[PDB]
Design an enzyme around this catalytic site. Sequence first.
Site, PDB file in Angstrom:
ATOM      1  N   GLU A  14      -7.141  -2.174  -3.044  1.00  0.00           N
ATOM      2  CA  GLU A  14      -7.650  -0.827  -2.844  1.00  0.00           C
ATOM      3  C   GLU A  14      -7.610  -0.066  -4.159  1.00  0.00           C
ATOM      4  O   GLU A  14      -6.700  -0.244  -4.970  1.00  0.00           O
ATOM      5  CB  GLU A  14      -6.837  -0.086  -1.774  1.00  0.00           C
ATOM      6  CG  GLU A  14      -7.213   1.370  -1.586  1.00  0.00           C
ATOM      7  CD  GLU A  14      -6.496   2.009  -0.417  1.00  0.00           C
ATOM      8  OE1 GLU A  14      -5.436   1.491  -0.007  1.00  0.00           O
ATOM      9  OE2 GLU A  14      -7.001   3.026   0.101  1.00  0.00           O
TER      10      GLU A  14
ATOM     11  N   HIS B  91      -7.946  11.218   5.020  1.00  0.00           N
ATOM     12  CA  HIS B  91      -9.216  10.789   5.601  1.00  0.00           C
ATOM     13  C   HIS B  91     -10.099  12.024   5.746  1.00  0.00           C
ATOM     14  O   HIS B  91      -9.916  12.819   6.671  1.00  0.00           O
ATOM     15  CB  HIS B  91      -8.999  10.095   6.940  1.00  0.00           C
ATOM     16  CG  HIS B  91     -10.179   9.308   7.413  1.00  0.00           C
ATOM     17  ND1 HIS B  91     -11.449   9.839   7.486  1.00  0.00           N
ATOM     18  CD2 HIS B  91     -10.284   8.025   7.836  1.00  0.00           C
ATOM     19  CE1 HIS B  91     -12.283   8.921   7.936  1.00  0.00           C
ATOM     20  NE2 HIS B  91     -11.602   7.811   8.156  1.00  0.00           N
TER      21      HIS B  91
ATOM     22  N   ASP C 123       0.852  -1.182   0.000  1.00  0.00           N
ATOM     23  CA  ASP C 123       0.000   0.000   0.000  1.00  0.00           C
ATOM     24  C   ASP C 123       0.889   1.234   0.000  1.00  0.00           C
ATOM     25  O   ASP C 123       1.655   1.453   0.946  1.00  0.00           O
ATOM     26  CB  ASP C 123      -0.934   0.007   1.211  1.00  0.00           C
ATOM     27  CG  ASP C 123      -2.037   1.047   1.095  1.00  0.00           C
ATOM     28  OD1 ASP C 123      -1.999   1.859   0.148  1.00  0.00           O
ATOM     29  OD2 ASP C 123      -2.943   1.052   1.954  1.00  0.00           O
TER      30      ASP C 123
ATOM     31  N   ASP D 180      -4.924   6.727  -3.548  1.00  0.00           N
ATOM     32  CA  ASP D 180      -4.559   5.622  -2.672  1.00  0.00           C
ATOM     33  C   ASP D 180      -4.927   4.315  -3.357  1.00  0.00           C
ATOM     34  O   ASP D 180      -6.086   4.109  -3.731  1.00  0.00           O
ATOM     35  CB  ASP D 180      -5.254   5.748  -1.315  1.00  0.00           C
ATOM     36  CG  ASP D 180      -4.693   4.794  -0.279  1.00  0.00           C
ATOM     37  OD1 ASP D 180      -3.838   3.955  -0.633  1.00  0.00           O
ATOM     38  OD2 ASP D 180      -5.098   4.890   0.897  1.00  0.00           O
TER      39      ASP D 180
ATOM     40  N   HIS E  52     -12.334   4.964   3.086  1.00  0.00           N
ATOM     41  CA  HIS E  52     -12.347   6.337   3.566  1.00  0.00           C
ATOM     42  C   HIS E  52     -12.487   7.280   2.379  1.00  0.00           C
ATOM     43  O   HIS E  52     -12.310   6.891   1.221  1.00  0.00           O
ATOM     44  CB  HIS E  52     -11.086   6.670   4.375  1.00  0.00           C
ATOM     45  CG  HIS E  52      -9.805   6.263   3.713  1.00  0.00           C
ATOM     46  ND1 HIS E  52      -9.553   4.975   3.290  1.00  0.00           N
ATOM     47  CD2 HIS E  52      -8.699   6.981   3.404  1.00  0.00           C
ATOM     48  CE1 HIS E  52      -8.350   4.919   2.749  1.00  0.00           C
ATOM     49  NE2 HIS E  52      -7.809   6.122   2.806  1.00  0.00           N
TER      50      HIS E  52
ATOM     51  N   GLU F 292     -11.466   0.537   0.075  1.00  0.00           N
ATOM     52  CA  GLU F 292     -10.603  -0.523   0.568  1.00  0.00           C
ATOM     53  C   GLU F 292     -11.426  -1.764   0.890  1.00  0.00           C
ATOM     54  O   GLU F 292     -12.642  -1.703   1.084  1.00  0.00           O
ATOM     55  CB  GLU F 292      -9.836  -0.064   1.807  1.00  0.00           C
ATOM     56  CG  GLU F 292      -9.088   1.240   1.610  1.00  0.00           C
ATOM     57  CD  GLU F 292      -8.247   1.629   2.810  1.00  0.00           C
ATOM     58  OE1 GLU F 292      -8.827   1.957   3.865  1.00  0.00           O
ATOM     59  OE2 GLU F 292      -7.003   1.614   2.694  1.00  0.00           O
TER      60      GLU F 292
END
Lengths: 52, 370
Positions: B351, B231, B143, B154, B223, B256
Amino acid sequence: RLRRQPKYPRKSAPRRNKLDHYAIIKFPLTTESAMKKIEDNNTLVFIVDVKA
Amino acid sequence: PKVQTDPPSVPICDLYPNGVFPKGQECEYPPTQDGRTAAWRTTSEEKKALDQASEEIWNDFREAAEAHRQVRKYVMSWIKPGMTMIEICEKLEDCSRKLIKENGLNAGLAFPTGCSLNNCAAHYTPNAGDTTVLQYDDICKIDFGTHISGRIIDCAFTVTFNPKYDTLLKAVKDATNTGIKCAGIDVRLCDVGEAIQEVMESYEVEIDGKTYQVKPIRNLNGHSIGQYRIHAGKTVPIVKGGEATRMEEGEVYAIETFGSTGKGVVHDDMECSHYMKNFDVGHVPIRLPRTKHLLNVINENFGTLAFCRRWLDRLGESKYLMALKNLCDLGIVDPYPPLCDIKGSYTAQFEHTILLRPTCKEVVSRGDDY
Ligand SMILES: [Co+2]
Protein backbone atom coordinates in the site's frame (compact mmCIF):
# COMPACT_ATOMS: atom_id res chain seq x y z
CA ARG A 1 -49.00 -56.42 54.90
CA LEU A 2 -45.59 -57.37 53.53
CA ARG A 3 -43.22 -54.90 51.90
CA ARG A 4 -42.56 -55.78 48.27
CA GLN A 5 -39.31 -57.73 47.76
CA PRO A 6 -38.86 -57.97 43.99
CA LYS A 7 -37.05 -61.00 42.62
CA TYR A 8 -35.48 -58.66 40.02
CA PRO A 9 -35.42 -54.89 39.42
CA ARG A 10 -37.88 -53.88 36.71
CA LYS A 11 -35.41 -51.23 35.49
CA SER A 12 -31.89 -52.51 34.88
CA ALA A 13 -30.19 -49.27 35.93
CA PRO A 14 -31.39 -45.95 37.37
CA ARG A 15 -32.36 -43.36 34.79
CA ARG A 16 -29.64 -40.76 34.33
CA ASN A 17 -30.40 -37.26 35.60
CA LYS A 18 -30.90 -35.52 32.26
CA LEU A 19 -31.62 -32.09 33.79
CA ASP A 20 -28.31 -31.03 35.35
CA HIS A 21 -26.65 -27.72 36.16
CA TYR A 22 -25.42 -27.30 32.59
CA ALA A 23 -29.04 -27.94 31.61
CA ILE A 24 -30.25 -25.46 34.24
CA ILE A 25 -28.43 -22.52 32.62
CA LYS A 26 -28.96 -22.21 28.88
CA PHE A 27 -27.12 -18.92 28.25
CA PRO A 28 -26.77 -15.44 29.76
CA LEU A 29 -28.76 -12.57 28.32
CA THR A 30 -27.31 -9.35 26.90
CA THR A 31 -30.26 -7.03 26.16
CA GLU A 32 -30.10 -3.32 26.95
CA SER A 33 -32.47 -3.57 29.92
CA ALA A 34 -30.43 -6.47 31.30
CA MET A 35 -27.21 -4.44 31.56
CA LYS A 36 -28.96 -2.06 33.97
CA LYS A 37 -29.49 -4.94 36.39
CA ILE A 38 -25.85 -6.06 36.61
CA GLU A 39 -24.72 -2.50 37.39
CA ASP A 40 -27.44 -1.09 39.66
CA ASN A 41 -28.87 -4.26 41.24
CA ASN A 42 -25.88 -6.65 41.44
CA THR A 43 -28.07 -9.14 39.56
CA LEU A 44 -27.40 -11.52 36.68
CA VAL A 45 -30.03 -12.38 34.07
CA PHE A 46 -30.17 -15.89 32.60
CA ILE A 47 -32.28 -17.97 30.25
CA VAL A 48 -32.94 -21.26 32.04
CA ASP A 49 -34.78 -24.50 31.43
CA VAL A 50 -38.53 -24.07 31.84
CA LYS A 51 -38.71 -27.02 34.25
CA ALA A 52 -36.17 -25.64 36.73
CA PRO B 1 19.08 20.30 13.54
CA LYS B 2 20.28 17.08 15.19
CA VAL B 3 20.46 13.50 13.89
CA GLN B 4 18.48 10.37 14.67
CA THR B 5 19.77 7.81 17.16
CA ASP B 6 20.24 4.16 16.22
CA PRO B 7 17.05 3.09 18.03
CA PRO B 8 14.78 5.79 16.56
CA SER B 9 13.79 8.23 19.31
CA VAL B 10 14.25 11.78 17.96
CA PRO B 11 10.95 13.34 16.78
CA ILE B 12 10.76 14.05 13.06
CA CYS B 13 10.15 17.77 13.61
CA ASP B 14 13.40 17.90 15.59
CA LEU B 15 15.20 16.47 12.56
CA TYR B 16 13.70 19.25 10.40
CA PRO B 17 13.30 22.34 12.61
CA ASN B 18 13.25 24.46 9.43
CA GLY B 19 9.69 23.21 8.85
CA VAL B 20 10.22 21.75 5.37
CA PHE B 21 10.16 17.95 5.26
CA PRO B 22 11.60 15.59 2.61
CA LYS B 23 9.49 15.41 -0.53
CA GLY B 24 8.13 12.14 -1.87
CA GLN B 25 8.80 10.79 -5.32
CA GLU B 26 7.57 13.42 -7.76
CA CYS B 27 6.13 11.82 -10.89
CA GLU B 28 4.46 13.32 -13.93
CA TYR B 29 0.85 12.32 -14.52
CA PRO B 30 0.25 9.59 -17.10
CA PRO B 31 0.01 10.67 -20.76
CA THR B 32 -3.59 9.42 -20.92
CA GLN B 33 -4.62 12.51 -22.91
CA ASP B 34 -4.66 10.50 -26.16
CA GLY B 35 -0.88 10.56 -26.46
CA ARG B 36 -0.42 14.15 -25.31
CA THR B 37 1.79 14.26 -22.23
CA ALA B 38 0.92 16.11 -19.04
CA ALA B 39 4.40 17.70 -18.93
CA TRP B 40 2.80 21.11 -19.37
CA ARG B 41 1.83 21.83 -15.75
CA THR B 42 5.33 21.48 -14.25
CA THR B 43 6.07 24.99 -15.52
CA SER B 44 5.56 27.57 -12.77
CA GLU B 45 2.26 28.97 -14.02
CA GLU B 46 -0.90 29.54 -11.96
CA LYS B 47 -0.95 25.75 -11.51
CA LYS B 48 2.19 26.00 -9.38
CA ALA B 49 0.84 29.17 -7.77
CA LEU B 50 -2.27 27.41 -6.46
CA ASP B 51 -0.07 24.44 -5.58
CA GLN B 52 1.83 26.80 -3.28
CA ALA B 53 -1.52 27.85 -1.78
CA SER B 54 -1.69 24.40 -0.13
CA GLU B 55 2.02 23.92 0.65
CA GLU B 56 1.52 23.84 4.43
CA ILE B 57 -0.95 20.95 4.05
CA TRP B 58 1.59 18.87 2.13
CA ASN B 59 4.38 19.31 4.70
CA ASP B 60 2.29 17.42 7.26
CA PHE B 61 1.98 14.49 4.86
CA ARG B 62 5.73 14.69 4.24
CA GLU B 63 6.62 14.47 7.93
CA ALA B 64 4.09 11.69 8.50
CA ALA B 65 5.54 9.71 5.58
CA GLU B 66 9.09 10.25 6.85
CA ALA B 67 8.04 9.00 10.29
CA HIS B 68 6.43 5.97 8.66
CA ARG B 69 9.64 5.27 6.74
CA GLN B 70 11.81 5.39 9.86
CA VAL B 71 9.32 3.28 11.83
CA ARG B 72 9.16 0.59 9.15
CA LYS B 73 12.95 0.51 8.77
CA TYR B 74 13.20 0.08 12.55
CA VAL B 75 10.64 -2.73 12.44
CA MET B 76 12.49 -4.44 9.58
CA SER B 77 15.71 -4.13 11.61
CA TRP B 78 14.67 -6.41 14.50
CA ILE B 79 11.65 -8.40 13.27
CA LYS B 80 12.29 -12.14 13.47
CA PRO B 81 10.31 -15.37 13.92
CA GLY B 82 9.51 -16.80 17.32
CA MET B 83 8.20 -13.65 19.04
CA THR B 84 4.49 -12.94 19.45
CA MET B 85 2.96 -9.91 17.76
CA ILE B 86 1.68 -8.40 21.02
CA GLU B 87 5.20 -7.17 21.79
CA ILE B 88 5.75 -6.50 18.08
CA CYS B 89 2.74 -4.18 18.07
CA GLU B 90 3.86 -2.60 21.34
CA LYS B 91 7.31 -1.86 19.91
CA LEU B 92 5.92 -0.49 16.65
CA GLU B 93 3.39 1.71 18.45
CA ASP B 94 5.83 3.09 21.01
CA CYS B 95 8.47 3.82 18.37
CA SER B 96 5.88 5.58 16.20
CA ARG B 97 4.65 7.56 19.22
CA LYS B 98 8.18 8.73 20.04
CA LEU B 99 8.98 9.58 16.42
CA ILE B 100 5.72 11.49 15.86
CA LYS B 101 5.66 12.99 19.40
CA GLU B 102 1.91 12.56 19.63
CA ASN B 103 -0.11 15.14 21.57
CA GLY B 104 -3.86 14.60 21.70
CA LEU B 105 -5.24 14.71 18.16
CA ASN B 106 -2.76 17.16 16.61
CA ALA B 107 -0.42 14.20 16.01
CA GLY B 108 -0.52 10.48 16.65
CA LEU B 109 -1.38 7.09 15.22
CA ALA B 110 -3.98 7.10 12.46
CA PHE B 111 -5.24 3.54 13.05
CA PRO B 112 -4.15 0.40 14.92
CA THR B 113 -1.20 -1.52 13.49
CA GLY B 114 -2.56 -4.43 11.46
CA CYS B 115 -0.49 -7.62 11.38
CA SER B 116 -2.42 -10.25 9.41
CA LEU B 117 -1.01 -13.78 9.27
CA ASN B 118 -1.38 -16.33 6.45
CA ASN B 119 -4.93 -16.42 5.00
CA CYS B 120 -5.94 -13.32 6.98
CA ALA B 121 -5.90 -10.16 4.88
CA ALA B 122 -6.47 -7.02 6.97
CA HIS B 123 -7.96 -5.49 10.12
CA TYR B 124 -6.37 -7.92 12.57
CA THR B 125 -4.37 -6.92 15.63
CA PRO B 126 -3.83 -9.12 18.70
CA ASN B 127 -6.05 -8.48 21.71
CA ALA B 128 -5.23 -8.92 25.38
CA GLY B 129 -4.10 -12.47 26.09
CA ASP B 130 -3.57 -13.27 22.40
CA THR B 131 -0.75 -15.84 22.51
CA THR B 132 0.29 -16.28 18.87
CA VAL B 133 3.97 -17.01 18.31
CA LEU B 134 5.33 -16.19 14.87
CA GLN B 135 6.70 -19.00 12.70
CA TYR B 136 9.37 -19.29 10.04
CA ASP B 137 6.71 -20.34 7.52
CA ASP B 138 4.57 -17.25 8.02
CA ILE B 139 3.72 -14.17 5.98
CA CYS B 140 2.62 -10.96 7.70
CA LYS B 141 1.01 -7.75 6.42
CA ILE B 142 2.29 -4.82 8.48
CA ASP B 143 -0.28 -2.06 7.94
CA PHE B 144 0.01 1.01 10.15
CA GLY B 145 -0.54 4.72 9.70
CA THR B 146 0.43 8.04 11.24
CA HIS B 147 -1.11 11.48 10.92
CA ILE B 148 -0.23 15.12 11.58
CA SER B 149 -3.19 17.39 12.35
CA GLY B 150 -5.38 14.78 10.67
CA ARG B 151 -3.28 14.50 7.49
CA ILE B 152 -3.35 10.71 7.38
CA ILE B 153 -0.81 8.65 5.46
CA ASP B 154 -1.52 4.94 4.94
CA CYS B 155 1.19 2.48 3.92
CA ALA B 156 1.53 -1.28 4.15
CA PHE B 157 4.00 -4.00 3.19
CA THR B 158 4.51 -7.74 3.62
CA VAL B 159 7.27 -9.52 5.54
CA THR B 160 8.42 -13.07 4.82
CA PHE B 161 11.01 -15.47 6.20
CA ASN B 162 10.64 -18.56 4.04
CA PRO B 163 12.05 -17.66 0.58
CA LYS B 164 9.26 -19.60 -1.15
CA TYR B 165 7.03 -16.49 -1.23
CA ASP B 166 9.21 -14.06 -3.21
CA THR B 167 7.24 -14.71 -6.41
CA LEU B 168 3.95 -13.71 -4.78
CA LEU B 169 5.60 -10.71 -3.11
CA LYS B 170 7.04 -9.47 -6.41
CA ALA B 171 3.69 -10.03 -8.14
CA VAL B 172 1.81 -7.94 -5.57
CA LYS B 173 4.54 -5.28 -5.56
CA ASP B 174 4.38 -5.02 -9.35
CA ALA B 175 0.59 -4.76 -9.18
CA THR B 176 0.81 -1.98 -6.59
CA ASN B 177 3.42 -0.06 -8.59
CA THR B 178 1.35 -0.43 -11.76
CA GLY B 179 -1.65 0.96 -9.90
CA ILE B 180 0.56 3.81 -8.69
CA LYS B 181 1.77 4.78 -12.16
CA CYS B 182 -1.66 4.27 -13.75
CA ALA B 183 -3.32 6.66 -11.29
CA GLY B 184 -3.58 10.32 -12.23
CA ILE B 185 -5.79 13.37 -12.59
CA ASP B 186 -9.07 13.02 -14.52
CA VAL B 187 -8.88 9.23 -14.83
CA ARG B 188 -11.61 6.70 -14.09
CA LEU B 189 -11.25 4.25 -11.22
CA CYS B 190 -12.32 1.39 -13.48
CA ASP B 191 -9.19 2.13 -15.53
CA VAL B 192 -6.91 1.65 -12.51
CA GLY B 193 -8.78 -1.55 -11.68
CA GLU B 194 -8.25 -2.68 -15.27
CA ALA B 195 -4.52 -1.98 -15.07
CA ILE B 196 -4.08 -3.66 -11.68
CA GLN B 197 -5.92 -6.81 -12.74
CA GLU B 198 -4.08 -7.01 -16.07
CA VAL B 199 -0.67 -6.70 -14.42
CA MET B 200 -1.21 -8.87 -11.35
CA GLU B 201 -2.89 -11.93 -12.89
CA SER B 202 0.01 -12.61 -15.26
CA TYR B 203 2.04 -14.26 -12.49
CA GLU B 204 2.39 -17.87 -11.38
CA VAL B 205 3.19 -19.10 -7.87
CA GLU B 206 4.86 -22.41 -6.98
CA ILE B 207 4.36 -23.22 -3.28
CA ASP B 208 5.03 -26.60 -1.63
CA GLY B 209 4.91 -28.48 -4.95
CA LYS B 210 1.51 -27.01 -5.88
CA THR B 211 1.21 -24.42 -8.64
CA TYR B 212 -1.28 -21.65 -7.86
CA GLN B 213 -2.39 -18.60 -9.84
CA VAL B 214 -2.30 -15.29 -7.98
CA LYS B 215 -5.58 -13.38 -8.16
CA PRO B 216 -6.81 -10.08 -6.70
CA ILE B 217 -9.06 -10.09 -3.66
CA ARG B 218 -12.09 -8.57 -5.38
CA ASN B 219 -13.63 -7.71 -2.00
CA LEU B 220 -10.95 -5.21 -0.90
CA ASN B 221 -9.99 -2.03 -2.73
CA GLY B 222 -8.19 1.26 -2.25
CA HIS B 223 -9.76 4.33 -0.70
CA SER B 224 -9.52 8.12 -0.55
CA ILE B 225 -8.30 9.86 2.60
CA GLY B 226 -9.85 12.95 4.19
CA GLN B 227 -9.22 15.37 7.03
CA TYR B 228 -9.26 13.00 10.04
CA ARG B 229 -11.22 10.72 7.65
CA ILE B 230 -9.38 7.58 6.52
CA HIS B 231 -12.15 6.69 4.04
CA ALA B 232 -13.30 9.82 2.19
CA GLY B 233 -15.98 7.91 0.26
CA LYS B 234 -14.10 7.01 -2.95
CA THR B 235 -12.85 3.46 -3.47
CA VAL B 236 -10.37 2.65 -6.24
CA PRO B 237 -10.93 -1.01 -7.24
CA ILE B 238 -8.38 -3.70 -7.99
CA VAL B 239 -10.62 -5.77 -10.31
CA LYS B 240 -12.33 -5.16 -13.63
CA GLY B 241 -15.79 -3.66 -13.97
CA GLY B 242 -16.03 -0.82 -11.48
CA GLU B 243 -17.41 2.70 -11.19
CA ALA B 244 -16.62 5.40 -13.76
CA THR B 245 -15.81 8.16 -11.27
CA ARG B 246 -12.81 10.40 -11.91
CA MET B 247 -9.96 11.49 -9.66
CA GLU B 248 -9.65 15.25 -9.22
CA GLU B 249 -6.89 17.69 -8.35
CA GLY B 250 -6.21 18.27 -4.67
CA GLU B 251 -7.20 14.79 -3.48
CA VAL B 252 -5.13 12.10 -1.78
CA TYR B 253 -5.57 8.36 -2.30
CA ALA B 254 -4.40 5.09 -0.77
CA ILE B 255 -3.73 2.69 -3.65
CA GLU B 256 -4.04 -0.67 -1.91
CA THR B 257 -3.55 -4.00 -3.66
CA PHE B 258 -4.15 -7.51 -2.35
CA GLY B 259 -3.16 -10.84 -3.85
CA SER B 260 -4.15 -14.31 -2.65
CA THR B 261 -3.49 -17.92 -3.58
CA GLY B 262 -7.08 -18.69 -2.63
CA LYS B 263 -10.56 -17.75 -3.82
CA GLY B 264 -10.06 -13.99 -4.19
CA VAL B 265 -12.76 -13.15 -1.63
CA VAL B 266 -12.69 -12.62 2.13
CA HIS B 267 -15.08 -12.93 5.06
CA ASP B 268 -15.16 -12.29 8.80
CA ASP B 269 -13.31 -15.09 10.60
CA MET B 270 -12.08 -14.18 14.10
CA GLU B 271 -12.80 -11.67 16.86
CA CYS B 272 -13.13 -8.06 15.77
CA SER B 273 -10.46 -5.67 17.02
CA HIS B 274 -10.59 -2.56 14.79
CA TYR B 275 -13.31 0.01 15.42
CA MET B 276 -14.18 3.34 13.84
CA LYS B 277 -16.62 6.08 14.78
CA ASN B 278 -18.84 7.17 11.91
CA PHE B 279 -17.90 10.53 10.42
CA ASP B 280 -21.41 11.12 9.04
CA VAL B 281 -23.70 10.19 11.95
CA GLY B 282 -24.66 13.05 14.23
CA HIS B 283 -26.23 12.85 17.69
CA VAL B 284 -27.83 9.54 18.69
CA PRO B 285 -29.23 9.13 22.22
CA ILE B 286 -27.65 6.60 24.59
CA ARG B 287 -29.36 5.14 27.65
CA LEU B 288 -26.44 3.42 29.45
CA PRO B 289 -24.07 5.49 31.65
CA ARG B 290 -21.15 3.19 30.84
CA THR B 291 -21.91 3.51 27.13
CA LYS B 292 -22.03 7.32 27.34
CA HIS B 293 -18.76 7.40 29.28
CA LEU B 294 -16.98 5.15 26.78
CA LEU B 295 -18.37 7.19 23.89
CA ASN B 296 -17.08 10.49 25.24
CA VAL B 297 -13.75 8.87 26.14
CA ILE B 298 -13.26 7.58 22.59
CA ASN B 299 -14.39 10.80 20.91
CA GLU B 300 -12.00 12.78 23.11
CA ASN B 301 -9.03 10.44 22.63
CA PHE B 302 -9.54 8.83 19.20
CA GLY B 303 -11.94 11.29 17.55
CA THR B 304 -12.93 9.96 14.14
CA LEU B 305 -9.73 7.91 13.80
CA ALA B 306 -9.73 4.13 14.06
CA PHE B 307 -8.90 2.45 17.36
CA CYS B 308 -8.41 -1.03 18.78
CA ARG B 309 -9.15 -2.70 22.09
CA ARG B 310 -5.45 -2.61 22.97
CA TRP B 311 -5.59 1.19 22.76
CA LEU B 312 -8.53 1.14 25.20
CA ASP B 313 -6.82 -1.19 27.67
CA ARG B 314 -3.75 1.04 27.32
CA LEU B 315 -5.96 3.87 28.64
CA GLY B 316 -6.94 1.89 31.75
CA GLU B 317 -10.53 1.29 30.63
CA SER B 318 -11.87 -2.19 31.36
CA LYS B 319 -15.23 -3.97 31.11
CA TYR B 320 -15.91 -1.91 27.99
CA LEU B 321 -16.53 -4.18 24.97
CA MET B 322 -20.16 -4.29 26.10
CA ALA B 323 -20.72 -0.56 25.68
CA LEU B 324 -18.52 -0.87 22.61
CA LYS B 325 -20.96 -3.23 20.90
CA ASN B 326 -23.72 -0.96 22.21
CA LEU B 327 -22.24 1.96 20.27
CA CYS B 328 -21.94 -0.48 17.36
CA ASP B 329 -25.67 -1.26 17.39
CA LEU B 330 -26.48 2.42 17.88
CA GLY B 331 -24.43 3.08 14.73
CA ILE B 332 -21.86 5.40 16.30
CA VAL B 333 -18.89 3.05 15.79
CA ASP B 334 -18.58 0.51 12.98
CA PRO B 335 -16.63 -2.67 13.78
CA TYR B 336 -14.04 -3.83 11.25
CA PRO B 337 -13.47 -7.53 11.93
CA PRO B 338 -10.53 -9.31 10.28
CA LEU B 339 -10.98 -10.36 6.66
CA CYS B 340 -9.66 -13.84 5.91
CA ASP B 341 -9.45 -16.15 2.91
CA ILE B 342 -9.75 -19.94 2.76
CA LYS B 343 -7.63 -21.85 5.27
CA GLY B 344 -4.22 -22.73 3.89
CA SER B 345 -4.20 -19.77 1.50
CA TYR B 346 -1.70 -16.92 1.59
CA THR B 347 -2.23 -13.19 1.07
CA ALA B 348 0.17 -10.34 0.34
CA GLN B 349 -0.49 -6.60 0.49
CA PHE B 350 1.41 -3.48 -0.53
CA GLU B 351 0.00 0.00 0.00
CA HIS B 352 1.08 3.56 -0.72
CA THR B 353 -0.52 6.97 -0.21
CA ILE B 354 -0.33 9.21 -3.27
CA LEU B 355 -0.72 12.97 -3.62
CA LEU B 356 -2.38 14.72 -6.57
CA ARG B 357 -0.38 17.92 -6.73
CA PRO B 358 -1.49 20.48 -9.34
CA THR B 359 1.86 20.18 -11.14
CA CYS B 360 2.76 16.52 -10.54
CA LYS B 361 1.96 13.29 -8.70
CA GLU B 362 3.90 12.75 -5.47
CA VAL B 363 3.88 9.33 -3.79
CA VAL B 364 4.74 10.61 -0.32
CA SER B 365 4.89 7.09 1.14
CA ARG B 366 7.62 5.98 -1.27
CA GLY B 367 10.81 4.75 0.38
CA ASP B 368 14.04 3.05 -0.57
CA ASP B 369 12.68 -0.21 0.89
CA TYR B 370 9.68 -0.27 -1.47
CO1 LIG C 1 -6.08 1.20 3.71
